[PDB]
Structure formats: C-alpha cells, structure tokens
Amino acid sequence: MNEVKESLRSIEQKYKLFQQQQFTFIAALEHCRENAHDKIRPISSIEQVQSYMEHYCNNSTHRRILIMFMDICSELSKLCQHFEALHSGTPVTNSLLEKCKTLVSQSNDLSSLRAKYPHEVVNHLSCDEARNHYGGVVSLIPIVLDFMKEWIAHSEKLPRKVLQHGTT
Amino acid sequence: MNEVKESLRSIEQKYKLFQQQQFTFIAALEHCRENAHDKIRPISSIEQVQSYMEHYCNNSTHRRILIMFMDICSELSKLCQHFEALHSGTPVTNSLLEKCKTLVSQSNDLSSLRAKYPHEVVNHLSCDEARNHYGGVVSLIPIVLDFMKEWIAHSEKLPRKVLQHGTT
Amino acid sequence: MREIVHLQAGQCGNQIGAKFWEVISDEHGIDPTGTYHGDSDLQLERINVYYNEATGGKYVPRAVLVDLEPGTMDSVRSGPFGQIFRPDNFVFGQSGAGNNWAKGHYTEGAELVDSVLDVVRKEAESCDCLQGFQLTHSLGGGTGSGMGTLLISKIREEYPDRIMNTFSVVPSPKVSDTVVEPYNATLSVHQLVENTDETYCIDNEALYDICFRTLKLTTPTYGDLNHLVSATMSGVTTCLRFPGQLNADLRKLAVNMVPFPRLHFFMPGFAPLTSRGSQQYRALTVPELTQQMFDAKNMMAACDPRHGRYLTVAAVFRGRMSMKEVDEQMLNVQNKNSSYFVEWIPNNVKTAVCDIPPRGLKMSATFIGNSTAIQELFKRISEQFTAMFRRKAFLHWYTGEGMDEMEFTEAESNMNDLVSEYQQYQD
Amino acid sequence: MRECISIHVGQAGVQIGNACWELYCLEHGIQPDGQMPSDKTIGGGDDSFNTFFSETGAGKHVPRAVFVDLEPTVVDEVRTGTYRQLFHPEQLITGKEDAANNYARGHYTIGKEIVDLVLDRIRKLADLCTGLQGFLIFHSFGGGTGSGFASLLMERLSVDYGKKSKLEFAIYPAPQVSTAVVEPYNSILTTHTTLEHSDCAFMVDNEAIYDICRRNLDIERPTYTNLNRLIGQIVSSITASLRFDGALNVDLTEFQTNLVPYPRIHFPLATYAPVISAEKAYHEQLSVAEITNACFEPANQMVKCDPRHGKYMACCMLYRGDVVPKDVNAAIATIKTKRTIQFVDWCPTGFKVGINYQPPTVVPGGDLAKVQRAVCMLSNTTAIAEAWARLDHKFDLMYAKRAFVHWYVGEGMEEGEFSEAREDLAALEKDYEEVGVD
Amino acid sequence: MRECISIHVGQAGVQIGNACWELYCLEHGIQPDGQMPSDKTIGGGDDSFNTFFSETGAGKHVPRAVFVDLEPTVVDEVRTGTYRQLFHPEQLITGKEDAANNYARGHYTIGKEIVDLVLDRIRKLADLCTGLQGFLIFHSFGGGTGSGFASLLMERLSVDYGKKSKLEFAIYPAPQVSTAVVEPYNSILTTHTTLEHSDCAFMVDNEAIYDICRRNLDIERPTYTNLNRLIGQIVSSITASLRFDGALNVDLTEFQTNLVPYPRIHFPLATYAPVISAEKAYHEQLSVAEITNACFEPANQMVKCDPRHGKYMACCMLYRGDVVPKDVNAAIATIKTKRTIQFVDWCPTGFKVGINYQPPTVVPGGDLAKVQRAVCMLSNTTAIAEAWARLDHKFDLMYAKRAFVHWYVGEGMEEGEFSEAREDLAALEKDYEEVGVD
Numbered sequence A, B: 001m002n003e004v005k006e007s008l009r010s011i012e013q014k015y016k017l018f019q020q021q022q023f024t025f026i027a028a029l030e031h032c033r034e035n036a037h038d039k040i041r042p043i044s045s046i047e048q049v050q051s052y053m054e055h056y057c058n059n060s061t062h063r064r065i066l067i068m069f070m071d072i073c074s075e076l077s078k079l080c081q082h083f084e085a086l087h088s089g090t091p092v093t094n095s096l097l098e099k100c101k102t103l104v105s106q107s108n109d110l111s112s113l114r115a116k117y118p119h120e121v122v123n124h125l126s127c128d129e130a131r132n133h134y135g136g137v138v139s140l141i142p143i144v145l146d147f148m149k150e151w152i153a154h155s156e157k158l159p160r161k162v163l164q165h166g167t168t
Numbered sequence C: 001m002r003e004i005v006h007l008q009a010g011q012c013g014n015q016i017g018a019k020f021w022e023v024i025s026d027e028h029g030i031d032p033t034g035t036y037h038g039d040s041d042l043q044l045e046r047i048n049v050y051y052n053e054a055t056g057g058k059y060v061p062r063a064v065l066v067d068l069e070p071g072t073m074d075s076v077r078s079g080p081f082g083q084i085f086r087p088d089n090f091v092f093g094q095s096g097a098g099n100n101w102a103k104g105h106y107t108e109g110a111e112l113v114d115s116v117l118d119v120v121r122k123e124a125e126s127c128d129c130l131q132g133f134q135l136t137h138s139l140g141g142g143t144g145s146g147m148g149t150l151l152i153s154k155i156r157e158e159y160p161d162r163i164m165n166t167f168s169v170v171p172s173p174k175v176s177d178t179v180v181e182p183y184n185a186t187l188s189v190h191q192l193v194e195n196t197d198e199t200y201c202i203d204n205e206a207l208y209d210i211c212f213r214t215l216k217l218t219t220p221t222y223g224d225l226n227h228l229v230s231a232t233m234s235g236v237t238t239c240l241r242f243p244g245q246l247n248a249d250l251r252k253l254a255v256n257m258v259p260f261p262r263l264h265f266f267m268p269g270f271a272p273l274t275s276r277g278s279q280q281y282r283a284l285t286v287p288e289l290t291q292q293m294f295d296a297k298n299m300m301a302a303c304d305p306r307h308g309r310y311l312t313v314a315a316v317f318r319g320r321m322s323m324k325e326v327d328e329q330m331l332n333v334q335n336k337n338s339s340y341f342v343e344w345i346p347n348n349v350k351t352a353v354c355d356i357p358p359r360g361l362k363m364s365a366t367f368i369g370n371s372t373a374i375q376e377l378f379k380r381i382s383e384q385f386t387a388m389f390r391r392k393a394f395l396h397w398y399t400g401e402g403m404d405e406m407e408f409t410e411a412e413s414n415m416n417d418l419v420s421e422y423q424q425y426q427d
Numbered sequence D, E: 001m002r003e004c005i006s007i008h009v010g011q012a013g014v015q016i017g018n019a020c021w022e023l024y025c026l027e028h029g030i031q032p033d034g035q036m037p038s039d040k041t042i043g044g045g046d047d048s049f050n051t052f053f054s055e056t057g058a059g060k061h062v063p064r065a066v067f068v069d070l071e072p073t074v075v076d077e078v079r080t081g082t083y084r085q086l087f088h089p090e091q092l093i094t095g096k097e098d099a100a101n102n103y104a105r106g107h108y109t110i111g112k113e114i115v116d117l118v119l120d121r122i123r124k125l126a127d128l129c130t131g132l133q134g135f136l137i138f139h140s141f142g143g144g145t146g147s148g149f150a151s152l153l154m155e156r157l158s159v160d161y162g163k164k165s166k167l168e169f170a171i172y173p174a175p176q177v178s179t180a181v182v183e184p185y186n187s188i189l190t191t192h193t194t195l196e197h198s199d200c201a202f203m204v205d206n207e208a209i210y211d212i213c214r215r216n217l218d219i220e221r222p223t224y225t226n227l228n229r230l231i232g233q234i235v236s237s238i239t240a241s242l243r244f245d246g247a248l249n250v251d252l253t254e255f256q257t258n259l260v261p262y263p264r265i266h267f268p269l270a271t272y273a274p275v276i277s278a279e280k281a282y283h284e285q286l287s288v289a290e291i292t293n294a295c296f297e298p299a300n301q302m303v304k305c306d307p308r309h310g311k312y313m314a315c316c317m318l319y320r321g322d323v324v325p326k327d328v329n330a331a332i333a334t335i336k337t338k339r340t341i342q343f344v345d346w347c348p349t350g351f352k353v354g355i356n357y358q359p360p361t362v363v364p365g366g367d368l369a370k371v372q373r374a375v376c377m378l379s380n381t382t383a384i385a386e387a388w389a390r391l392d393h394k395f396d397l398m399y400a401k402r403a404f405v406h407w408y409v410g411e412g413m414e415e416g417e418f419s420e421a422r423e424d425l426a427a428l429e430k431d432y433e434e435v436g437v438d
C-alpha cells in the first residue's frame, strides 16, 4: 500500500538528475523555440514541447531529454490512477485527489504557478525569459509532489473508519 | 483514439501544400469561370466546381489540381461518421458535433466566412474579385479544423464520467 | 572558446590514444556508439575543450592519429571505439619506417608532413583558441621519435604561443628490445631539448613492478597498464575540465614548476592504488592518502630519487576535500624531510584541488614531481652511447640515408651540457 | 548620498564577494527573486539599501559592486547561481585567458582591452551615484590573475579621480605557507606600484583564520564557507555605520584621518572580539570588559606578528549592539592604565570609538553565535615590519638566483623594476624603524 | 497640412520600406485588409493617417510612399505577400532590366523610359496632397540599381520643385567590408552629383548595427528583420513630430535650418539611445541621465567615425515618452560642464530639443525593449571626413590603373566624370578641414 512513495523516491531522484539537467533542458528548449517561432507565449502546454521535438532534432539529446519529460508526466498519471480508486477518502485527501486530477492535463493553466522556498528552479533561472515566461513549467512537478505526499501524510492517521471507504 | 488526429496531420501538411499552390488553383478556377459564365456569383457551392471539371479540361493540371479538393472533402466526410458514434460527450464536444455535422453540405452558403489572425489567404488575395467574392470558400477548411482540434483538446480533459456516455 | 587538440604518434600511441580516449568517454558516460547519456551538466558544458560536436550528440574527438602500418589502425578501428575516431584523422603512409629514426625523420616524413599539417590546421581553423597540443609518443619509438621531432619542428614556430606538452615512455633500462634505440632516443632528445616545454617521462619496468606490487594479479594486459597511465594523464587533464577552486591551466602549472628553461623532463605521481581486499581493508583518509602519494615506491616514472633531492612538487586532489588537510600535510612533509629539499628554494610545494569525485572512487589525487633523479638516467644513456659510438655499430643504414657522426658529436656535446647543468644546479 | 562602490578582482575574490553580498541580502531580507513582500520598501532607490543595493521602480535591487575575473569557471558558476537575477549580467566581467600568476602578463598583455569596458561600467555607475564616498575592493597581493589587473585598474582610477577614498583589502602572503612561488614576486611588485596611489590597505591571513576556527569556534573541519562568512561579518561591521546610525556616527574619512598619523604607512589590521561558537555563547555571557580583553588578546590576531615585539600607534573600536558609555569608558580607562600595552609616548590619544545600537545579525544555517554586543578592533602597530623582513629574506635569494625569470623576460620585461621594488621595500623598513624609535 | 511623399529606390530599400510601413500599420491598428475595426475613422479621411495613409470613404488606407525597383523578383514576392491589398497596384513600380551596379547604365540607358512614369505617379500624388512638405527618400549609396535611377529622379524633382524639402537616407559603404568594387565608383558619382541638390542627407552602416545587436540586443543570429526593425523605429521616431504632439513640435524645415550651419555639408548622423534587449529592459531602469550618457558614448553610433578624433557642431535630441524639462536641462547642463566633449567655438550652444509625451511602441514578433523614454540623436561633427578619406585612398590607385573602364566607356561614358568627382571630394575634404580650423 506504501509503494506510491517507493516509486516517488525514484521519481524525485530523476528530478534531481533534472536539477543537474535544468539549464541544459532550457538550453535545448530555446534552440527549439527559435525553430518553432512561437516566442510570444507563456509555456504551459506540452504541445509546444511536441512541436519542438518532432523536427530539427538531429543531435542525440534532442529526443531523449524531451521525451523523458512526457514519460514522467505519464508516470505520474499512472500513479494517480492508483489514488483514484483506493478508498473514498477523508475530505482533505479527496481535495488533493480532485485538484491533482485537474492539474494532470495536457494544455492546462500551469503557466505562472511559481512557488515558495526553497523551490530553487526560478532562483537558478536566469533572466527575463524566466521571469515573464518559465513559471509553472519548472515548478509544477514538485507542486504535485508535495501535495501528493500530504496525501500519504494523512494516510497513517486514517482511522478504522477510513481504512474502509472505497475499498469496500 | 488519436488516429483521426494522426490523419489530420497529413491533411494539414497537404494544406501547407495548398499554401504553395493556392493561387494557381485560383487561376485555373478563373480559366473555368470564363467558359462557365457564372461570373456574377461568389463561389460557395461545389456543384459549380463539378460543372467546372467536365469540359475545357484537356491539359493535365486542370484536373490534377481541381479533383483532390473534393477528395479531401470526402476524406473529412468519412472522418465525421467515426465522430458520430463515440460517446455523447461533454457539452462543448456535443456542440462541436452539431457544428461539424451541420457544415457538411454540398450546396451550402460558405461564401464569405472570413477568419481572424493569421489566415493569410485573403492577405494574399489580390484585388476586388476577393473583396466581392472569394470569402469563406478559401478558409472553411481551417474553420472545421481549429474547432474540431479544440474538440479533441477536451479529450485529454475527459473524466471517467465522460469516458462512458455513448460508447455503449 | 579555449580547447586542446591532441597528437597521437608512434606504435605506442596506437594503443595509448585509444585507451586514453575511451577512458575519457567512459568517464563522461557516453555509449560506445557515441550518443551521450545525459548525466553530467558540468562535463556536457565543458566538453568543448576536447571534443567538437557532430550531428547526433556526437562529441567528436579532436585527436590526430598518425602511423605507417595500416594493420594497427585497422585493429584500432575494429576496437570498441574505432567509431569515435574519424576517417578524417586516419592519415598514414603506405610503407614501413623500419623504426629507423633517420628514415622516419627525413625519408617518409618528407611525404607525410604536408598531409599531417593539413589535418592539424583543419582542426585549428575549425576551433577558435588552443592552449596548445599534447603529444602521445615515445622516445623509445623508432617512428614516434622521428615523426614527432618533425612535427614539433613544424609547429613550434607555427603556433609559437601555445603549450607543447609531450608524453613519452623511456625504454626499459634493463632491456630495450632493439639495440639502436639508444641512437634513436639520443637524436630525438637532441631535437626535443630546444623545442619542447613539457615532457612526461614514463618507464615500463616500473609498470611491471607496480603490477607485482598492488595489482598482484599476475597476468594483466599492456592495455591495462595503459589504463593506469591514462588514468594518471586524465587526472592531470581534468583540472581545466572541472570546477573547484584550483588554478588549472597547464601554463599556470608550468610557470610555477620550471625554475630554468632546460627543465623539460618530469615525474608524475598518483593516488589510491588498491588491491583485491584493500578496498575494504583501507581507511580512506587524507593523511594516509598523503603517505601513499609520497611513498618511496608510489613513484612510477624513472627510479627512486633517494640518491638525489627534490626540486619542485605539485599535488592536485580530485574529490570532496578541504583546505586544512592539504595545508597540514604540506607542513608535515616539510618538517618530516626539510633536508631532502633543495636550499635554493623552500616551499617547493604547489597545491590544487578539484571538488569533483572520479567515477568509482570518491576522493583521490595526482602528483607531478621535478626531482634530481633523471641524472642517473641520462648518465646511462650517455654511457651506452659512448660505448656504441666507440665502435660505430649499426651505422651503415644511417649513412645510406645520408647522415653523419658529426650530428651525434654535437648532440652528445649537448647531452654533456645538460649533465653538467644538473650537476651544477643540484650539486 | 551615503554610498560606496565595490570592485572584486580575481576568482579568489569572486567567492568572497558573492558570500558578502549574499549576507547583505539576507539581513536586508532580499528575496532571491529581487522583489520585496507586500511591505513597501521600493521607490527612487532610497531606503536601507540605497547605500549598497539600488532598487528603482522596477522593484529589483542593484548591488553596487562589479566582479572582474580572468577565467570563465567560477564567474559562470555564479552566472548560473541563485541570486543571478539580482546580479547584473555584465557587471560580472569575465575574460578568456589567464595572467598565469605573472604580474607583467596580467598587467600589460590583456589588461589594456578589458580596462576600457570596466571603466565604462565604473562611469555608468558614477553617473547614477551622487555621494560616492569611495570604493571597496576584494583582491589579494598574490593575485594569480587579479593582482596585475588590479594594479593597473587602481592606477587608472587613482589618476582619473583623486578626491574619494580607495579601500584595498587583501590576504596576506602566508608567512610560512606558499601554494606558489610567483607570489613573492607579484606581491612586492603590487606593493611598490600601489604604495604611492593606494589610500587604505587592510589585510587578513587564512592560517590564523583557521586557528581561530578551531580555537573558539572549535570547528575541526571548517571551510571557505566560514572563511568568507567571517571576512563578510568584518566588512559588515565596518559598514554598519553606513547601514544605520548609532549614538555617534563616523566615516571612512575619519578612519583615514585618525588612523593615519603619517603618510605611506596605511596598513592596519582588523580583529573581531566575539568570535565564539553558538553553544559557547549560549552558556556564557558577553560584555565590555571581556570583549576588550579579547580584542587586546595577542593571539586572536589573524596576522603572524607579535604586539609584544611591536609598538602600537592606532586603535579604533567599533561597537555594534547594546552598550552604555559608562562601563565602556571604564574598560578603556583600565586599558590605558594597564602597562602591558605599550603605545608610543607620541600619542596621548590613540583610541577612536564608534557606536551603533543595532545588534549584529546572523545567518540561517550558520555556525556563529547570538551576539548582542560586538566590536571591531582596527589597530596599527610597528609589529608588522617582520612580515616584510621575512619576505625580503625570501626574495633576495630568489632574485640572486633569478629563478623563473625566463618567463618574465620572455613575455618582455627587465630587471630595473625588480630592483627598485626591493629598494622601495628597504625604504619601507627604514620608515618603519625610525618611527617606532620614539 | 502636414504630409510628405516617400521615395523608396533600390532592391536594397524595397524590403526596408516594406518593413517600415509594416511597422506603421501597427500603431494605427491598420488591418491587413485596409480597414480599421468598427470604430468610426472612415469619412473625409483626416486623422493620424491623413499624412501617410489615405483612407477615403472607400475605407481603405493608402500610403503616400512610392516603391520603385528595376527587377521583378522582390516586388512580385511582395505583390504575393499579405499587404498587397493595402498597396496601390502600380505604385509598386516593377522593372524589367537591371542597372548592373552601373551608375551610368541606370542613369542613361533605363531611366528615361521610367522617369516619365514616376513623374506621372508623383504628380497624381501631389495633386491630392496639400501640405506636401517634402520627400523621404530611402536608397543606397552603393546602389546596384538604386544609384543611377535615384540620381536622375532626384535631379528631376529638384528642377521641377525647388521650393520644398528632400530627405535622403541610404546605407553608407561598409568601411572595411566590400560586397562590390563598382560600389565606390558609383558612390562617388552619386555624391558629387547630389551635393548641389540633396537637401537633408543621412547615412547608415550595417557593421555597427550588427555590433549593437550582439552588444545590447544580445543576438548572435540576427537578420535584416532586426536591421530594418531598427531603422524603421528610427524613422518612425523622426516622423512622430508630425504624427502626434508633446511639449513642442519641430519640423524638417527647422531641422534643416538649425542643423545646417553652412551649405553643401548636410550629412549628419542619427542614433537611438534605448537600443537594448527586453531582458535588460525589464531588469533595469531608464532615465535621462543614463540615456544621455549612452547617447554620447562614442560607440553607440552606427558610423565608424571617432568623435574624439572629431569636434561636434550640431546635436538634436528627441524625447519620446514622459519626462520633465527639469532633468532635461539638468542633464544638458552637465553636458556643457563636461570637458571631454569638444564642440567648436563657433556654436555657443549645440542642442535642439524636442518633446512628445507618447512613449514608443513595441512590435509583435519584436526583439526590442519595453522602452518608455526614448531619444533620437541627430548630430554632426568634423570626424566624418575620415570616411571620404578612406574612400579616396581606395579610389586613387584604382583610378591610376583604370580598372573596369572598358565597361563604362563601352556603355557610353568617358573619364571627365570621374576626373571631376575626385577634386569634388577634394573640395569636400578641404572645406571639412577649413571649418574644423577656427
């Protein structure tokens, strides 16, 4: 029943590999943006990422470092399907469930959702492109991550009443 | 599920070609028009184009450019029956269902349906022949295109509730 | 930006460059096919000092590989990393030198020099600014010595503002296989002395003894000994490649090393050498690191300087370390043997630390020493040369190519000059 | 108004500048974005920052410093750092090559083509600044690249503007430790070139810094993090009087005028008394008598010179936190009664005190203590000449053997400057001894 | 009222005029159809457009500019572009033959049969025009086909209408980059034929435009898109005085009268201060003092002439945005106090000031900044003589060997023209130095 965080630790270790790979990610992303020509937009939809990757990707990294991003956003949906059924849930766990369900989306409003300390992503981020664009795109992963670890944070305090809500 | 969008992508690559050969289609359509004498009319009905094909078409290109427009029209015509079944759909999806079903009409009114940015076709349209004629006839394809695309946009948003509405 | 392009020459260079480049590639985590696997931002950023990039994430090496016999390059290409090396950099003659210094210095060089210069200047135009070139060869190589002398003569004026780093393995003092290796090496060093700046001296007896010492595994390959030496030279390279407050540039090091121009022959030093059970039988701490690095046998280049004294020493440290340990180690060695240093300069100690661990081991180091131990070496070479020049052995080939004993006379006059030079300075 | 501008030359100075500016933004509560919370502090750049940061209507502070560095490595590290959005992009001046620790190479070969743009930075700061009381520069004598560039830049700014204050701060050449031997050369070169244009030179040494770190902070494995933090608290102490007011304010002008009896000699040493570990100050108490005993303790010094062999000229004590005049003057009276301290008979007064009520501030994740009362003791004495004695005893033999000189002559210099450097030094000692002669 | 006719000659100038009016439609919100949205603007045709566009009751705006090109290629591609419906059909003069960079070819062989048509165009523009103050000519000095046709047409408009102004703007020959060596020949021909008729001449050079682009616009792969963007922003700023109002409006006529001290020499130089990337724009502050220091920075100007080699005679600053004359005059007073900048003794003052309150406008798909205060700098100085010096020492040895002559002598010319032009430029240089000497 605990395996969600077992997967989550590998996911966050990938996120730290991305912490190494973050300036590189945007370094490729900007060359992709120049070739895709849509510079007037806050990057929230991964459709810009697909438009970036289908073409002008003649250098090894150009495919992998983009495709694992879609891979992890699919993996998080795979985890969330587990949360979807389990038990019905206390109201707080419910709210986490529904908000994460909404925020798991392709072209959503995850554009300028900057967060609180430490969330060093925007701190490490450079300049105006990162302060007018590059908002929710860099912080949405840990946002979902912490708001889903509070979901298990109440699971150990789920009483006998909540142990059987949607499992039965 | 996304097979129809896969087919579209090819359709709009052929539309990119339409950008390359659009004015030549217009010139050949003129060569049709002088011998057709239906000159006091903005073109809206493809019955006019069927009345174009059968004669004064003894030079290859005349048929070659002309015919494939009806081929893609029948292509989207085939595409609509698959949409007809799926599920009942989210209200916006249902409204797009009625829109797409309504617009398919051979002797229709699609003559002056001008569209917004960028829609460069009227921009490239030269003179008053297009300021009194040649309106929706040159971009009704993007009109179904963009709105059927924002139809499938809610497919990634579809909940478990909307997964099963008409499929059974 | 600022980069390095490498010259691989001689039949030792054949295997050595291959091993060195594959060591670098594995250190940076690229597949044998050539598509890098994203793991290290620092190395991805800093690759531009060694590799250019080709369509496909293909960080193509800027190394120029030269020899005469096609079989060696065929074997290298069939090797696990022949693909990383380009047909552009595969330049060669279609004959054999006989490992004759005179032939490889005048006869076939006369036809290959144009193309090798073409390749190196192709790369030079391709890039912006070099620190210079480093060379892998041997003075113990009949073809390496001659062709390397030719190319250094070609280039030391062509780029008079760069680093002429050289790596050369001295033939075994107990056995040199060929009998004319003393002649070849004497001529080679005669040309090298006025041209080069840096020369790393290597010997193979020491490699075998290290194998018997800590490898202890009976039967490794010459390729594995190349693995070790390539690890050493890679360690000395990484300084520029990686962050951490240490002044990295080879000129930074050299200007800090060489008291007077004629010092071009240098003794490396290396860090943890570990045996079968010593991985779990070793307490990995900076003080015992220091002890091992300045062991009496950890040296690997020529021989024990125990006869002589210490001129200059530099220690670089790869991993997560702090300043105080290396400082106190310097103090402790200074106090341990102040006598074994040379009075003309105290504090022969130079320090540099990179904060990046190696792959496989956490904290390690490298060392470079300039000491008074090469004297007995070239005294050897002087003695064999005097002996073989006494009766003029094996000289008809050289005469037929068109040389004369006069050359050897001034070359060995120069060697005696260096003899008296070292003896005066450290005596 | 009340503003000074900081230069930081050398990759040795870049990390210390980064750390100090980090500290500053911490106590100012500067969010790493560059913008304040709902509370209003921004305007035409007039608040507690207008001395150090510059936060115009855009709402983002502009630190009044420029980091010049010869190599891309650490400058691009900070160009990737956290507060880089705060940092001005091309106020982080970077070069492509090295000075190779070579004084002339760093002063002549490539300086000429960087000094112009850095002067442009200086003047484009000057136009906006008004008060411009002077400059604060993080460098070293033994600049492996910073030293020669610093010498040329100092000469240029001295000749262009000779009315403000020049404040040089350096590590000293470690007396019995040397990571490189080009330093004995470049140090004396910088000294003899700077003595006639530099205004106020202050000095530190890492060996005694670490000695403190395990004496009272008791840290067995400290780092540069702590090194930079402590030099940062030193400079914060010297800049507190500008940050705020106290009972009585003072300024760099007074610092020079009082601290300098006679010209040339402008090489005092700072000390910070309440250097102590958090647990120690947690279970002990602080006050004027003990902090004065500490600042007069002969070993808390970070320079390997002995006061008991030297002879004192100047002492300035800057108190930050809560004090009263009564007990502090009692302490200083006890001092001037005490016979161990041997000032010159020349000065009846040799004391200058400066008061701020605001206590020193701490850093999260730090290792220092809860200081409510601190004092910086900036003192000058004859004890310093031993360092130059040791350095000339080192250099005479290097010069006679003329080791390493092939490189300098090859890059294109000569011998007369290396001579006149040593006669300038000998002048320095002949001016140090007769003044200590009462 | 206020309006002018623009000329656009040269395939060098066709796309720049295209881009200029592409910009122009933005600020007025002119749709690519030719009609503004449902807000009432169509009627008698008198609003901000009435000077440049002509939107009658037919509702379609009509620019008062002439595009002339001698090759069908680019004019047909724009005649296949997106605004051709805006463009009047045959004001896009398309040519069936080329001038081969040959000034005499484009001045004798081809001009005659098209000068009549362009005259008819300009007269059927002048009838509808009422104020018609002058003409804004966009061309190129090394005109591959913009040289000879432009020369002939300027001669004809001069002879027919010598009462109104003529505004010449062209790319100066690249001082050290050569795309053609017939370029100097045709350039000197044009210069000496223009000196007596050209009213207000202004020159551009692409090298320093590129230098600015990677200096402060921070682009490593810019293009003509950006080039023409900059120049179009320049000309929009200079037309702003006619477009809108501010504190004061000054016209090309006064630009002439003041900016010209003495006849012949009417060759000043423009500059834009707030050329800067949007990132620096967002995280920096803009105001009069720094923008003026920038505008007097010697390398912010596209021409490769050294002002500290020269001496200033004229300067004109235009302020687009919201400012106060308080700081305006304060800055200019600082300027007059400054000792580096050396105006000539003859002119006590050197400024002409212009104000309009409306801040500049950005473009969709634009690389420029979010600028609020802008200044155009129209300055004239002695140093420019260096450009013609460089051209003439290019000229002399070419002339000595008489290269390419067979071309021109066969197509129908002789030596007397080039003979004249040499002492013509000699007269130019000698009066340059004569006015330089006081």
Ligand SMILES: Nc1nc2c(ncn2[C@@H]2O[C@H](COP(=O)(O)OP(=O)(O)OP(=O)(O)O)[C@@H](O)[C@H]2O)c(=O)[nH]1
Pocket (backbone or CB within 6 Å): C009, C010, C011, C012, C013, C014, C015, C016, C098, C099, C137, C138, C140, C141, C142, C143, C144, C145, C177, C178, C222
């Ligand atoms: N590649 C390689 N070189 C070796 C090996 N063992 C010893 N060597 C020595 O490395 C030296 C340098 O090689 P080269 O510079 O290519 O020698 P060369 O000019 O071709 O002359 P030779 O000594 O005849 O090979 C050789 O002279 C050998 O003595 C080995 O196992 N592999």
Ligand SMILES: Nc1nc2c(ncn2[C@@H]2O[C@H](COP(=O)(O)OP(=O)(O)OP(=O)(O)O)[C@@H](O)[C@H]2O)c(=O)[nH]1
Pocket (backbone or CB within 6 Å): C245, C246, C247, C248, C252, D009, D010, D011, D012, D013, D015, D016, D070, D071, D098, D099, D100, D101, D139, D140, D142, D143, D144, D145, D146, D147, D171, D179, D180, D224
């Ligand atoms: N100021 C300062 N000095 C340091 C620091 N860390 C070590 N040092 C000492 O300061 C000296 C730095 O001098 P250099 O190496 O010549 O530095 P540089 O001239 O700026 O250029 P590089 O040689 O490339 O580093 C070293 O010898 C150290 O002894 C530090 O963080 N700041």
Ligand SMILES: Nc1nc2c(ncn2[C@@H]2O[C@H](COP(=O)(O)OP(=O)(O)OP(=O)(O)O)[C@@H](O)[C@H]2O)c(=O)[nH]1
Pocket (backbone or CB within 6 Å): E009, E010, E011, E012, E013, E015, E016, E071, E098, E099, E100, E101, E139, E140, E142, E143, E144, E145, E146, E147, E171, E179, E180, E224
């Ligand atoms: N004004 C302007 N000049 C340009 C442009 N692009 C390049 N140039 C420069 O302007 C010059 C063009 O002049 P010409 O070649 O004589 O053009 P032309 O006289 O109209 O006739 P052609 O010979 O057909 O080109 C070139 O040498 C370029 O260096 C541009 O977009 N606008």
